[model samples]
Target: TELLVLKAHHDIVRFLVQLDDYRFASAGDDGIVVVWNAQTGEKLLELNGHTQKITAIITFPNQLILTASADRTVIVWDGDTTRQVQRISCFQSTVKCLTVLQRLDVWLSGGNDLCVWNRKLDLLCKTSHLSDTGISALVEIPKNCVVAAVGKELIIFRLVAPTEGSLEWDILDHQDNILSLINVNDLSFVTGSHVGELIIWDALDWTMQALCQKNDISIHHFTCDEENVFAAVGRGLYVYSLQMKRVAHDSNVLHVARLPNRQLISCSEDGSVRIWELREGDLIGHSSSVEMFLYFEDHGLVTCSADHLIILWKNGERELRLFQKLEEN
Candidate 1:
């Protein structure tokens, strides 16, 4: 396996992202967000403002970055300048979830209270509390509606409801405490529970779509591509078909992505990431865990570790190979 491991921070790396154009960002448990030239492993800028740990970081359209923290705030920052543009303070509790809408200056967030906001950090609307259970996942699905998954329930609402402030929501149930959610399409949805189960649902009718293996390893992250192929992160990594079938499995898989030409990549808690060619369900041409898997695209995989290192793997015939430069650009 070819690999390049560079130092990053002094604490745990909570998140990472690569837009497939070689630029990337990493957030530390120490409350710092660092943008990097992924290929060169060069430090670009450090954005700081949150007083507490940053739990998640996401890149939005228009070269902006969104971050959520235990400090009870979400900040919109210029991805290139790394400067804070707008800051949103979620009252009383930490903001656990954030979803940047595909259009409009609007976005949605939820924490101790399920809520929504615009890019300016002003409260646009909010839903009544089903309970103070804390919202964990926020995803925008069909019809401009946003779905917020709480401790045991999923709340669905329209983004542009004209009636007033926060629109009312339809609460959906789960078999176990659903911790991770993904809105695949107009008719497909997926939820991963704390009980190590990954359950697919019908987004249109909220009906059970299909059930993958209930290994109960606590699948915490799930994301699918335009074609319904899914990659997930949790106690280990997994790959599933649109039919709700388990296609592949590798212990320590944490984050997954679908690449062009039916290829797949998975990162893990074992400090490693792997790539696979999806045919029927076999994890062909595997890679080992080098650092905690963060995120990636077709060109390479991104990862960070307890050792303060960020590693990029690419170009392996069968495993993780170091990426020295951007392949397409």
Candidate 2:
């Protein structure tokens, strides 16, 4: 379902993070995080703290505001009043990314090093010197492991799993300055290099299953479902089917994040963020044979979400026979 457009920020909306079933928050260049009613499309309240643009925003369970900013600090804002619960200024580099593990009640701050903390602003653990440029992105993999984009290198760390604790570093690999990473399934994940080389890796082997090569352009973001994976490539979008693949867009696509169903949101440098649907076809008006077959129409079969159970009316008086009419090639 689509909610009507609700305007709040004067700057472009870079992120749409879900808070609850009916609530979400949006943040971007304006340095303001505005909560909105997902069902009604009404602005709730503006969370203000970041003097610089919000670098990353993530929500924890039971409703807590955790946002990192260009100002090189992390702020945990209490949602009830949007008041700053705790402010952290201990970072060697900018905190460009944030992620949470609800199962463990801990979150990570990524930049020059990987820092793990909790809701109370406790620094549970931290990684050693990672990069001069710092971590550009972060994503979770299976088995309490997470992959961080350290410029051209991809680091997967195994957590001993405390609130949490000591993590073992596994230095893996990458192609160009690999910018995009995603864990599509439990058994596999896909990573893309800056040169447009997309590799679907078997997580078990930590190697490539398929290398989908593209012509040009860097992929900024990726979205996928059971059937396919889509990349926001350059000034357009590319659909790499999860079959031959087909997909497009316009201007520089900043981000393409998904919603509850097939609802997709794309952020563009053209100063707009649009919602898209992946709906196929509608099961229209008909199905059945003889008296029950009155609902059938010509050669086609009809199927809808309703009446999921099916029964074939058997002709007891006449036995069905198959002849030399057809054979599967």
Candidate 3:
């Protein structure tokens, strides 16, 4: 097998997003956003504005890029030019998460409270005098609803209502801090909490449907497709069935990603990237802890690490091969 290695950033990669089938973006502790050509492993553009680490990123309509930072600012950018168009600083604390409802032309940013704004950056509504630690994650569902993870609870809100621009919410308390959330379907959702608990909820009635699985360590991330739920927990990757039962486990996982092609890839703190499937397992090595990765069917695999490097891998006739490396200073 062959491997292509590249230096990606000056600091650890905090997040990675697929811009499209041909392009991807990466945010790091270095406080910059980098867009790369996934096909050729080329650095297409470097977005410079954030004064601190970028916490979240979501693409808005009309080729716009929005990023939240620890610097307490939300900067909007032109996806094509990679230039900052607007900078918003309405949050008193670091903006941790962002989600958008394209149908409503509204976006939500969460930190100390839930703030909703339109694409024009106009503040439409915000929660006031609500006491909680902060909002950790957000997910939107049908029926004009938004769900948020606030402290150790999940709050559901009706976006368009009899009382417009209101802070009224239905709160569902949980055992620990809710860290991650995902919309399972139009009428259901799933959450992972700090106490290593996974709970499925029915969005229609906002009732607990099932307690999925429990881990000894807190769940750091959650990703799923039509078939399975994958959780990245303390140095391990756990795969669960749709019924929320653990099906498989791979230890030493730092991050896990699933491809649309039904393949699973995971990176570990041991500086190794492992490919897992029903038939066989493939492994690749790195110099330092691999932080995160993104897998694409057309562009193959891209990974970043504490070593400040980004590596791209492609599938060969018989094995996975490294294709290119991008080095960043």
Candidate 4:
């Protein structure tokens, strides 16, 4: 019934990681990690453990939290008490990203070097003088291997034993900084640079499975769900289709929501709200000037008006279909 505008961090929110379907945590310039209910936009935890900008955050087992920062420290947080459980300051460099290896029961910090650590704040192992450019992204692969990004190149190391990574840029090159990397599955992993260069790598031998370069995009973070990869490009998000058609409102179109299955919703100043699939359209919803909207992800659409009404439109059929899907599976 309302647009949830969460205002907790005073500065830029550089990272957002979903803790569950309804919960997410954000961290950035203010050195604060704020956990929020994504379904309600309610601030749940305002955790302050770092003295400077937060560079990396990862949630461990047992409702645990871990964060790395420009302060050159890593802090472990407990979820139940919402308190700092431990502060680790052995880092000589700021941690750029934190990657976990759950089965091995340890995590790796990507920064000036690829350093591994335990939950007890022990530095277990570290790679060679890996990168003068700093390790911005890290991922794990089979056969005890780790992939880390150093400037435009990718370095691969092992968790144990001979961990020497003897590890690109041109037309199929990254325009600038290589910033983000993630594993899609056991067989493949993806890396995206600051200027939007993505390369798919074979996990076994560390070769190019595929290379993709297009668009002017700054990938802040990357999320892979099933067969599709979603890139975080700020509040405006990503994903689209060429089957796109236009929808209209009498006055100004205040907002628009597009569903995953290609259906859409829009609200306007013309005292109306509408739905579209580039086919049939609903003519009426609001009684007066429809001013704003918020699509609760795949849940529903909300429209607020000057007529003192907040309308929530739910697709009952979709819920039935979703339940049917569960039944079928």
- lDDT of model 4, residue 117: 62
TM-score, structure 3 vs. true: 0.79
Ranking by TM-score: 3, 1, 2, 4
Models 1 onward score TM values of 0.74, 0.66, 0.79, 0.59
lDDT of 2 by residue, 1-329 (tens): 12133455544444455545455565566676766553355667668866676757656855766678777777777567878767788775566677766566567775666556776547545455545556656666576554434444553433233234345553324445555555674445666554555556564666565545443333433344456566665555555655565543345554455543455545444323344556421111112110111012111111111122211111111111111222221
Tens digit per residue, CA lDDT, model 3, 243-290: 546473334565655554456666666565666663335554454677
Which parts of model 4 have CA positions greater than 4 angstroms off?
Answer: 1-3, 121-123, 143-176, 193-199, 209-216, 220-329
Off by over 4 Å in 1: 1-3, 18-20, 121-123, 126-130, 153-166, 170-175, 185-187, 193-198, 209-213, 217-252, 280-299, 318-329
Error of 2 at 104 (Å): 0.5
* lDDT order of candidates, top first: 3, 1, 4, 2
Name the candidate, 1 or 4, with the larger lDDT value: 1
Runs off by more than 4 Å, candidate 2 = 1-5, 39-42, 146-149, 153-175, 194-196, 210-225, 241-250, 257-268, 271-329
Comparing 2 with 3 on lDDT, the higher-scoring candidate is 3
TM-score pick, better of 2 and 3: 3
Clashes of 3: 9
What tens-digit string does per-residue lDDT give for candidate 4 at 1-329? 33344455444445454445455565666676666554465667678856677767665645766678787777777656788766778767677777766565566676776545666546545445555556656666666554443443543323332234332110014345444565663445655443544445665665654323233333322222333344433233334221231113345444444454656555555555555553434544334555434345644444444443233445433212322455577
Q: In candidate 4, how many clashes are counted?
A: 0
